[PDB]
């Protein structure tokens, strides 16, 4: 059931790790995960040759829970496209953790980068620090995004958290920088925080709930009203919410701002 | 008298009075359209080693288009 | 004394290819119809160093080395480098960049132009949205209206007016008077200055403009009563004045790449422009900087799929900007070795980039004394494109002109350079 | 009615309301012949809600005209009939439908809005 | 030398209908004999053919590499190394080198870029020379260029006529490309054509009058291809009527290649968008039948079909007013680029689900040209590639067309009801023949390009061009196997170019560097002179380059490769 | 006082940086940052005079100049270059591109001496390899 990764020292070139997830741990030895290559740089390389490894088998990754006993500061895409099970890491990871994932759970004991949960579609990723740019974003290009899941960041993210958001839900406790939800198709982010500007730019729909302060918002909204105690994709929110329809620079923009009125009567 | 007169240290090179000139753009098509002139022609000024360099100001007619085109005041209609 | 003529100038992206070269004995002496800045390229300024041969630092001295050696240094250090950082490109010509191309396949390196501090950001919009241009012929004879918004081309781009407004159309025939000229600029600039419309806008609030202007023209009412420092009234006569347009350009550079927001900037107002295409014909140019830095996103798009931040450390080409750029490795200390060529990151690279300069390998294939140079392990001089050296460029939008060779030069050229580099580097891996 | 809100010593209410439309609760015809007017303003001047407006301009031998169109906005016209009046050479049909079609032409107003 | 013997040869041209036969090949030629000392490429219980030959594919220029440039997402879903080769990426729209390798996988040979903008032709022929293997050539487009309209206006074919053979030289071109006549340069102020006799703004020509014009002009030219036309109102319902009045316009002209084989005046492309019927998208129908059999009756007429391939593609023309309408209905990003007195261009993604309704009926359209076509002669198998589907699914186009069941498979399951309420596809049970797909896919394209000397053909002179797919005709049935037809054609067992191996058991094993072939016209002196001194007028006042920086330098063709028109 | 920094082009810093980096040219046209008129008196200094730039990312040393392109109230130019690369902001935002535009900084005058071009670049401390 769980399988521990000790980090050793932490190369400058950093770490690429698709393989780290209970699909491929699942059903291999302790020699085997051993023998499980990852990228150093342009160098393929063994998992061993980076982590000291211990802990039991099993042969389903429902079953397996990966612990990452250290900080990986410098290793990108641990957990990419894991179908089931879970990884802990104590410490901080690079890029992509969970990218694609489709199911099981990922927790982030210190802080991620940029691009945690791009293209997500289901399963839950949890980052107990902060999270870098591009939350649960899409790829460059792609107009189709994020699709289901859960990601939750206790500390602070940056921009473009939920860039062409199409379902799913994040949730942000701390702050974000600009532009949350830019391109937004469908699902719910909430931001506990404050946000510095560009709240739902260019968004066709879904919901971005702010429960701080923005501190700039954007003309192409229309304004039509307060509402009280909405429930947004399972979640209750209590308090009142200054509502906003747009953003009305996109042809046909059904999407929703909803920004707490202790905090902002300036956008009203 | 009034006339055409230079200042080649502030000058740009950009080239707007050459185009804008109706006698430069009279005498060569290209001139006319833009460009720097590529025939031998004989105009009134040019942008040579990167600055404006009146070739011709016998016919320059005082008129003032080259000197509404240039922002930096390098190119000027005053006494001498 | 010799004029050579039609030559295209090696600076900006407004590639002017009718350059009057003055040429005495194998040296160019003097330039027609070339702005201040062409000008100066053309022609040697006296006491600036022209390196007559590579150079390597041994600890803390430089010494004269030959093309064998120097190559054969700098070759090790790309074999042997596990995230090697290949950048510059946009100085140089075409056949040169496809050469890195391959060069950047075999070291499994990252590689990357100026776009990734120019308009890369414009390359992330337009892979999101869109990318409606035109080719300056358009603009010369049919703009109706020309914006140029976050630009100053009387200081970066000197000719662009001269050629594209002022010069008269076909169905232009008046030149300046036959269009409508907009600026967009914090600054009152001297391009700003010969503008009929100046929106001095606040800084780092084009988005929030974008957006009013946007929802405005879609039939919308603006939230505010002022936007960007702009009153709500103006931004409504602004939209009018692009709507009534027959022909329109949106001339866009560094005032929305660098600011707040940046790729986000070029996505709003492209979309506007593609949407004001219901009521006028509208289209957009970016005002792209090195007279070659599109030839590289172009030869690089074609023989990879990518335009830029292209990785090939995988052998498969990869590419997300933000973890393959340039900055991103240098300043995320990713890269452990660097090839520049034809463009100086020393000058250019903010702060935190050139500290990672500093513990590191840095080749650099450059003709002058630079910032970077200061900053390099092994120099190596080549013939420059566009006097010395001849090649494939492409212009802002995209219309290809072939470099000319003016004069002689004992040096090799940026090709030669990276084709013996690429030979060693295989001998290496071999 | 928004009373507390103001009333409140430490600014605690928030009340919002939702008001109709102005051309909503008003009902007429308007049409100007644009061939017939002249273009001397005294509409535009007079009309107490701005709701006509003119694209002045100065003339040209191209465009020999002090005028280019007029336009009113029915968003904004509350049918009072000012500017048919004052109208030197009647280019303006205007007639109020208030008395014999408001009933079925004017919706009765509906205020909404919420508390907090 | 190499001897390829016991293949089944299919080569429709000289006639071979699958008969047992060696090929025999000497210094990249096809020859009677060769010496015992040759090296032996065992075809036993396999199929023999000549190189493929596509002539309507977008692969090189500027308009194919925005669609690569703005597309990152269509790179990261299909990126490739080959251990020997070079990198590339693109499922839709692959870089260059992935380009070559793949159209040679699949035994093709010889590929066209289909519409080239003159002032950009430098970047046509660069990305060509990282184009692996295939000989190649452009077509530069003529159907709004500034000078044709305003020759043809005064009705001055011999000028115009001067005119195309400077601009074919300039831009190393093979052939007079004519892309919604009239119709793109209204897209310079916005708008466009609806009709064949609706003229553009200012310039006062119609598009009939273009098109009869410049049919008129290449015969004149005596070029090998005809006029290569991709017709006014595509993609709109009702259309096929403009359709069969754009066909009638140009049959009352002679063909007259001096080089080649070519019997017709005119070639249509991708012309199942051009057989829309209805007159909205809600009542819209397949009016292929009346398309397919205006050109059964008709001899002057060769088409390529543009068949859906039902993928999530990219589409890219010079029909920029029909692109943005697209953009339009779809939402999705759209990229324009108008040329300076020569064309314009677009470029939209599009994702031509077999569950939508007009996808649907669309990939029916195309069905039914292919099979109520009689003369295979008269066709060319295309997708207009990447416009309906990328030229990858050459193969799974050639499955369809072999076979009934893949078809009704289709039909009665993922495929939209509207395919069989909407079009006859349904009761059509026509099977083409090894001989007829070696026929649309080799034969008919190399004759109508005035190549068939040298390319499409397995007969003594012909170019060592040669592809061997591992499929046995007498053990396998084409009806029922139909995935063995599609992955047998996808990777070929061995393919030879000029002599020389270039694939084996569907692995690129070689990369050399094919030809271009453009097309060599002489004029009268006179004509000549006086039309280039009326072009460099227009460059001075109108262009934004200069005229002697123009044409394509002969460093861009390594390997040039002439055809004659007309000369003296 | 803290000000707006805002960079880019000059037609005389172009000119310098194709005559050459090492000439002292450069130092002029793009060691110096460009200040409204009554900036310049509200901060007690006169053209020529030197100027302390000090931001969250570094600090630099440039020669006053008064703006002939005016800039709004509150902002100041300096020219692209390494002067100017000293102090403007280096994130990217997960774009590859720095934030060279609109920085605030904190300027004061100075009586230090502005860098040449190679004194400054060993501010960064480079090590042989
Ligand atoms: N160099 C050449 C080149 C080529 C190219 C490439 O260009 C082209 C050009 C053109 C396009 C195509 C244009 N795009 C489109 O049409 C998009 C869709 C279109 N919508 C419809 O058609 C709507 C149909 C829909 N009908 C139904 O839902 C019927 C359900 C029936 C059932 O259930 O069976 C229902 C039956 C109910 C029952 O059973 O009783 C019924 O029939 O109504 C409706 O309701 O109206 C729109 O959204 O507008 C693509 C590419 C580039 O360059
Ligand atoms: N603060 C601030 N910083 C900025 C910017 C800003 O606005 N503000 N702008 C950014 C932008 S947009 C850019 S593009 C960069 C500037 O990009 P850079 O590439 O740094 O610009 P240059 O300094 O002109 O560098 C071009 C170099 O190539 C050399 N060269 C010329 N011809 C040839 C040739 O044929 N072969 C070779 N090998 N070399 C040749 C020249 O000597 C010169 O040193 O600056 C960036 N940095
Ligand atoms: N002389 C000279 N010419 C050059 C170069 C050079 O170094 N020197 N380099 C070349 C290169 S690489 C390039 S990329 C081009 C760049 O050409 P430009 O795009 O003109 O680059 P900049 O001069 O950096 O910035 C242009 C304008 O953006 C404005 N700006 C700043 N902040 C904002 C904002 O928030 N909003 C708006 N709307 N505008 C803002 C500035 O006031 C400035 O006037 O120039 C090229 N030409
Ligand atoms: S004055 Fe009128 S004429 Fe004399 S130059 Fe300036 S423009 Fe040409
Ligand atoms: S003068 Fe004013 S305009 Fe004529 S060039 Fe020197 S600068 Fe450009
Ligand atoms: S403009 Fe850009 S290109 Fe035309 S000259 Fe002055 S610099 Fe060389
Ligand atoms: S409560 Fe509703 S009503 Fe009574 S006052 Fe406050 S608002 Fe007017
Ligand atoms: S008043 Fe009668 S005339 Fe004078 S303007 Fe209003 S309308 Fe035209
Ligand atoms: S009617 Fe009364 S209101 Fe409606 S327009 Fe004429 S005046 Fe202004
Ligand atoms: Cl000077
Ligand atoms: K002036
Ligand atoms: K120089
Ligand atoms: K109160
Ligand atoms: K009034
Ligand atoms: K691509
Ligand atoms: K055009
Ligand atoms: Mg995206
Ligand atoms: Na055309
Ligand atoms: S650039
Ligand atoms: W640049
Ligand atoms: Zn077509
Ligand atoms: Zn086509």
Known sequence: SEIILTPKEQPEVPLEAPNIKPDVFAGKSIEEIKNIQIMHGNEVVKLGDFFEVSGEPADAPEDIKIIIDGDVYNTKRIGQEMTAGEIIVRGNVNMYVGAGM????????????????????????????????????????????????????????????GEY???????????????????????????????????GGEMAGGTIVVKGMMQEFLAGFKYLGVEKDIEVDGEELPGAFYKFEGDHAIKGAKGIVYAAVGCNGHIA | AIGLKAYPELCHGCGNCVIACPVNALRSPEVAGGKGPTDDVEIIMIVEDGVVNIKNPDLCGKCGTCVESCPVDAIRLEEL | MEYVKNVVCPFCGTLCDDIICKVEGNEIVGTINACRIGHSKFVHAEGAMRYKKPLIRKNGEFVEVSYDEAIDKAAKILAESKRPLMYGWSCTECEAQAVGVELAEEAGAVIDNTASVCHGPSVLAL?????????????????????????????????????????????????????????????????????????????????????????????????????????????????????????????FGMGITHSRGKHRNIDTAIMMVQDLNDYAKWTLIPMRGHYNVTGFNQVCTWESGYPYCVDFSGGEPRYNPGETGANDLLQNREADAMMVIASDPGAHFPQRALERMAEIPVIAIEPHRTPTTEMADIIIPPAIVGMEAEGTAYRMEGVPIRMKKVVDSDLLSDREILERLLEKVREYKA | CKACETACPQDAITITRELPERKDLVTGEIE?????????????????????????????????????????????????????????????????????????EIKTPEVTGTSY | EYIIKNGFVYCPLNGVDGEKMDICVKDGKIVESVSDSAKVIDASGKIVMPGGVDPHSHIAGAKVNVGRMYRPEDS????????????????????????????????????????????????????????????HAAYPLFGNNWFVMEYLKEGDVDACAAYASWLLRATKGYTIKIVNPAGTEAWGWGGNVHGIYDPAPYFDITPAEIIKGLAEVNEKLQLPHSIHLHCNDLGHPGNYETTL????????????????????????????????????????????????????????????????????????????????????????????????????????????????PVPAVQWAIGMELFLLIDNPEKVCLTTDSPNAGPFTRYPRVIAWLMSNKYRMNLIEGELHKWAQRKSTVATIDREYTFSEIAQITRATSAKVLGLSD????????????????????????????????????????????????????????????????????????????????????????????NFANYPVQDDYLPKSAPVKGVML | MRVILNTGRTIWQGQAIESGKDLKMYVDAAAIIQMNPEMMKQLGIAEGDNVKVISEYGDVVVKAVEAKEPLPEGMVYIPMGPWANRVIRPYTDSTATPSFKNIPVEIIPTDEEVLDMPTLMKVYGKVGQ
């Open chain 1, 165 to 199: 958001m199409n379902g799913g839900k994040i949730i942000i406790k701390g702050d974000v920088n600009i532009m949350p939800g830019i391109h937004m198709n469908n699902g719910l982010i909430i931001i506990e925080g404050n946000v510095v500007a560009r709240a």
């Open chain 3, 127 to 251: 892979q999101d949205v869109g990318y409606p241009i035109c080719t300056f012929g358009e603009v010369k004879n049919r703009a109706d209206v020309v914006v140029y918004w976050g630009c100053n081309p009387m200081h970066a781009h000197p000719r662009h007016m001269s050629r594209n407004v002022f010069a008269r159309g076909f169905f232009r025939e008046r030149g300046r008077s036959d269009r409508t000229l907009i600026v967009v600029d914090p600054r009152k600039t001297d391009s700003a200055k010969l503008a009929d419309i100046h929106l001095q806008l606040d800084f780092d609030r084009d988005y929030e403009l974008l957006d009013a202007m946007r929802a405005c023209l879609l039939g919308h009412e603006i939230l505010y009563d002022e936007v960007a420092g702009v009153p709500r009234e103006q931004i409504e006569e602004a939209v009018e004045v692009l709507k009534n347009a027959q022909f329109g350009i949106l001339f």
């Open chain 5, 76 to 135: 990261k879903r299909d990126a490739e190394k080959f251990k020997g080769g070079r990198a590339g990426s693109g499922f839709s729209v692959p870089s260059t080198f992935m380009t070559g390798y793949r159209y040679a996988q699949m035994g093709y040979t010889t590929a066209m870029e289909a519409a080239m903008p003159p002032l950009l032709a430098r970047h046509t022929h660069e990305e060509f020379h990282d184009t692996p293997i295939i000989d």
């Open chain 5, 245 to 356: 009045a754009s066909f009638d316009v140009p049959k009352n002209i002679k063909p007259n290649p001096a080089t080649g084989s070519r019997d017709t005046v005119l070639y249509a492309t991708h012309v199942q968008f051009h057989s829309y019927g209805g007159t909205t998208w809600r009542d819209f129908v397949s009016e292929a039948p009346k398309i397919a059999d205006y050109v059964n009756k008709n001899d002057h007429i060769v088409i390529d079909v543009g068949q859906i391939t039902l993928d999530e593609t990219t589409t890219m023309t010079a029909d920029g007013p029909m692109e943005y309408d697209l953009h339009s209905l779809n939402g999705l990003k759209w990229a324009n680029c108008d040329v300076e007195l020569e064309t314009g261009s677009g470029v939209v993604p599009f994702i031509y689900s077999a569950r939508a």
């Open chain 1, 102 to 161: 489709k199911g099981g759970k990922i927790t982030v004991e210190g802080n991620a980068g940029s691009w945690a949960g791009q293209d997500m579609r289901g399963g839950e990723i949890e980052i107990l620090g902060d999270a870098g740019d591009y939350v649960g974003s899409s790829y460059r290009g792609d107009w189709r995004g994020m699709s289901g899941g859960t990601i939750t960041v206790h500390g602070n993210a940056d921009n473009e958290i």
């Open chain 5, 454 to 545: 040298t390319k499409g053909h397995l007969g003594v002179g012909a170019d060592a061009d040669i592809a061997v797919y591992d499929i046995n005709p007498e053990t396998v049935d084409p009806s029922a196997e139909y995935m063995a037809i599609e992955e047998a054609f996808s990777r070929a067992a061995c393919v030879l170019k000029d002599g020389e191996i270039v694939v084996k058991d569907g692995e690129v094993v070689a990369s050399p560097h094919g030809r271009t072939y453009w097309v060599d016209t002489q004029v009268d002196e006179s004509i000549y002179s006086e039309v280039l001194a009326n072009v460099e007028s227009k460059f001075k006042q109108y262009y934004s380059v």
């Open chain 4, 32 to 104: 100007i012949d644009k061939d017939t007017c002249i273009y001397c303003g005294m509409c535009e001047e007079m009309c107490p809600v701005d709701a006509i407006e003119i694209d002045h301009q100065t003339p040209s031998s191209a465009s020999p005209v002090v005028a280019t169109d007029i336009r009113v906005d029915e968003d904004k016209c509350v049918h009072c009939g000012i500017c048919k009046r004052i109208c030197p050479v009647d280019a303006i049909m205007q007639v109020c439908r208030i008395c014999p079609y408001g009933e079925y």
